[PDB]
Amino acid sequence: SGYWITCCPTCDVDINTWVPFYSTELNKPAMIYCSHGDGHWVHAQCMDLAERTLIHLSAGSNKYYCNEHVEIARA
């Protein structure tokens, strides 16, 4: 799949316009794995994750569910 998917219906990451946002980014967008179903990758920026939240997510073993799937996971 990769860094340049359309990760969700409102995805705003584009290989033709992307620039760094998070302090950990250089040339590629930060991504996080959503554990819904078979699993899929989303761009952290498209989820509106703050840098602090993203770093905490990356440092732990808790599963993440993206904005489209978290309501289903908590039901």
Partner: peptide, 9 residues
């Protein structure tokens, strides 16, 4: 959670 591009430079 698994992530990409979250390592401190």
């Amino acid at each position: 959670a698994r992530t990409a591009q979250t390592a401190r430079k």
